[PDB]
Amino acid sequence: KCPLMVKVLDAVRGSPAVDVAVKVFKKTSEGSWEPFASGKTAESGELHGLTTDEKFVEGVYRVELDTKSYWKTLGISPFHEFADVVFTANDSGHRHYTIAALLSPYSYSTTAVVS
Amino acid sequence: CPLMVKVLDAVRGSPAVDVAVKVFKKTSEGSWEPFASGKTAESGELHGLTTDEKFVEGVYRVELDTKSYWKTLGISPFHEFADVVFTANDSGHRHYTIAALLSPYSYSTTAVVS
Amino acid sequence: SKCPLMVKVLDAVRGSPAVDVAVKVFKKTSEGSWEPFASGKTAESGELHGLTTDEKFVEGVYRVELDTKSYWKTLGISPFHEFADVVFTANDSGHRHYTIAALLSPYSYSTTAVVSN
Amino acid sequence: SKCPLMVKVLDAVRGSPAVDVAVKVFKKTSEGSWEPFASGKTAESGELHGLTTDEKFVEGVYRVELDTKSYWKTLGISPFHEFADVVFTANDSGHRHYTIAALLSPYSYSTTAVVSN
């Protein structure tokens, strides 16, 4: 039943990325980003329960991982200010989305699983 | 479960289903001998390859048959396969996840070790 | 070279450079908005050179945006992301040279920074 | 530009080229064994050129092995993998030029092939 999940891994430690701050924004008709949902990754590196099928309507979404604070907490000065993932959701029926991310200090990878 | 494999498809945005996986263990003599095998489920995951007791200290080679995967989908891929080779259980007993992200001419792999 | 900001892009589906990828660069203002800084497209090599100089490329927060959506749709492929952007602080301990490398798939991308003195 | 097999490696932890990565190339035989074909180390650019020539780079199954374990150990880091290898058939349908690109982290790597006629 979870329509939008986030999963984050740490490529330096070979572990889930724990305590990663996540902010979701939804684009408005006027074109601005308004706050939609927020949370933190658990011990699993996964974030559940951001939203529900009812609230997760058609629109353009931006998922922002606070990668800078993550690396700095571990004593590492990273390259990026954050990692944004921007996408259109539910444009042709309701789907379930997973945004996965793999983090290094100077690099990240992100994949979408859509079902 | 001490050794899990998880595979994603970057072209379709989905689990990579029915990926054949072969695992080998290096012998004292230096050759690869078969150790375990299976296929990824609809989840893109493969569980139950081995047990904590059977998964002894050694050098392991996990081979994903990426070529068969892409050819089944009507795509001619670059690699013959994707091998992931590593020492396991040399410093305390651990659980490993080998994750893989596949495109026709590219792949990424990560280890989660707990 | 004297080139302080380069972009290199590869296509993971075709096994080739990503050609004619549109790139927009922005610089964060005092008020907290993005103003246009530079723009170009990747060449046959998948690379974009000559975006800026060390005179113009001063200390600040920059945003580099690849139009990944238009790139895939030109090839007949419907991609996941609206775009791929990279946001970073530049030149805050003196001038450096930066390369933003990116690897593209329809539902996935990776980006790496190479920073040199 | 005449170079038929190139290797390019980046370090995702340092944000730099991966320098002095040991590279070994093998070619498969009729009997199914790996015979040595070429070897070298990445330069300060992270690139390795001059491994072979078009005349020597004949049709066959090749194995390119990056010694990632030694690389990380030299930097004081205990890495996950024994190495990173890329196995592929080359020059089966026309003679081509190949670039094997890799991005390294201690517990992760990505590899991409760029093929050009």
In chain B, the N- to C-terminal Cα span, in Å, equals: 11
Chain A nearest CA to B30, separation (Å) = 27
Helix, strand and coil percent figures for chain B, each rounded to 5: 5, 50, 45
CATH number of B2-114: 2.60.40.180
Going by C-alpha positions, the residue among C115, C82, C89, C83 that lies closest to residue C100 is: C115
Alpha-carbon gap, residue A34 to A27, rounded angstroms: 6
Q: Which amino acid is at D74?
A: T
Both tokens of residue B60? Answer: 């392991």
Alpha-carbon gap, residue D15 to D10, rounded angstroms: 7
H helix or E strand, kind and range, residue B30: none
Contact (CB, 8 A) for B50 and B67: no
The answer to whether the CB atoms of B105 and D115 lie below 8 A apart is yes
Q: What are phi and psi of B54, to 5 degrees?
A: -70, -30
Q: Which residues of chain C are within 8 Å of residue A111 when distances are taken between CB atoms?
A: 107-108
Q: Which amino acid is at B48?
A: G
Both tokens of residue C5? Answer: 């900001």
Tell me whether D89 touches chain A (CB under 8 Å). no
C-alpha dist (Å) from residue D90 to A12, B79, D4:
33, 10, 10
CB under 8 Å to D31, separation ≥6 — which residues?
none
Q: What region, left, alpha or beta, does residue A80 occupy, with left being phi > 0 and alpha being psi -120 to 50 degrees?
A: beta
Q: Which residues of C60-72 are buried (b: 16+ CB within 10 A; e: fewer)?
A: bbbbbbbbbbebb
Going by C-alpha positions, the residue among A102, A94, A79 that lies closest to residue A15 is: A102
The resolution in angstroms reads 2.0
DSSP output for B42-92: TTSEE--S--TTTS-SEEEEEEE-HHHHHHHTT---SBS-EEEEEEESSSS
Contact (CB, 8 A) for B59 and B31: no
Instruction: Give the three-state DSSP class for C71.
Output: helix
Burial classification of residue D86, based on how many CB atoms lie within 10 Å of its CB (0-12 exposed, 13-18 middle, 19 or more buried) = buried
Q: What is the dihedral of CA A69, A78, B97, B113, to 10 degrees?
A: -80
Q: Go through chain B and tell me how many residues it has.
A: 114
**Strand runs (DSSP E) across A2-106, as ranges?**
4-10, 15-16, 21-27, 33-40, 46-47, 59-65, 83-89, 97-104
Q: Which residues of chain A are within 8 Å of residue C107 when distances are taken between CB atoms?
A: 111-114
| Strand C60-66 versus strand A97-104 pairing type | unpaired
Which residues face A103 on adjacent strands? A10, A108
Tell me whether A109 touches chain D (CB under 8 Å). yes
Can you tell me which residue has the tokens 């199954």? D61
Contact (CB, 8 A) for D65 and D23: yes
Q: Which amino acid is at A20?
A: V
Helices (H), C1-117: 68-74
D1 is in an annotated binding site: no
Q: What region, left, alpha or beta, does residue B48 occupy, with left being phi > 0 and alpha being psi -120 to 50 degrees?
A: left
CB under 8 Å to D1, separation ≥6 — which residues?
none
Both tokens of residue C92? Answer: 């805050």
The residues spanned by each domain of chain A are 1-115
Q: Which CATH architecture has domain C1-117?
A: Sandwich (2.60)
DSSP summary character for residue C94: B
How many CB atoms lie under 10 A from the CB of residue D49? 13
Contact (CB, 8 A) for B17 and B68: no
| Strand C47-48 versus strand C5-11 pairing type | antiparallel
Going by C-alpha positions, the residue among A11, A32, A14, A34 that lies closest to residue A24 is: A34
Can you tell me which residue has the tokens 């305590």? A19
Alpha-carbon gap, residue B70 to B19, rounded angstroms: 10
Going by C-alpha positions, the residue among A22, A11, A23 that lies closest to residue A76 is: A11
Chain C nearest CA to A21, separation (Å) = 17
Angle at CA of residue D112, ends D106 and D116, nearest 5°:
155
Strands laid side by side in the C84-90 sheet: C34-41, C22-28, C60-66, C84-90
Q: Which amino acid is at B56?
A: V
Helix, strand and coil percent figures for chain C, each rounded to 5: 5, 50, 40
How many CB atoms lie under 10 A from the CB of residue D25? 22
Q: Return the CA Rg of chain D.
A: 14
DSSP summary character for residue C82: S
Q: What are phi and psi of B67, to 5 degrees?
A: -65, -45
Q: Return the CA Rg of chain B.
A: 14
CATH number of A1-115: 2.60.40.180
Contact (CB, 8 A) for B14 and A114: yes
Burial classification of residue D17, based on how many CB atoms lie within 10 Å of its CB (0-12 exposed, 13-18 middle, 19 or more buried) = buried
Instruction: Give the three-state DSSP class for A1.
Output: coil
Contact (CB, 8 A) for B111 and A10: no
C-alpha dist (Å) from residue B35 to A7, A19, B22, B31:
30, 37, 8, 12
B6 is in an annotated binding site: yes
Going by C-alpha positions, the residue among A59, A6, A65, A67 that lies closest to residue A33 is: A59
Instruction: Give the three-state DSSP class for D73.
Output: helix
Tell me whether C101 touches chain B (CB under 8 Å). no
Q: What are phi and psi of A105, to 5 degrees?
A: -50, -40
The answer to whether the CB atoms of D82 and B86 lie below 8 A apart is yes
The neighbours of chain A, by the rule of 3 or more Cβ pairs under 8 Å, are B, C, D
Q: What is the dihedral of CA C71, C74, C78, C83, to 10 degrees?
A: 20
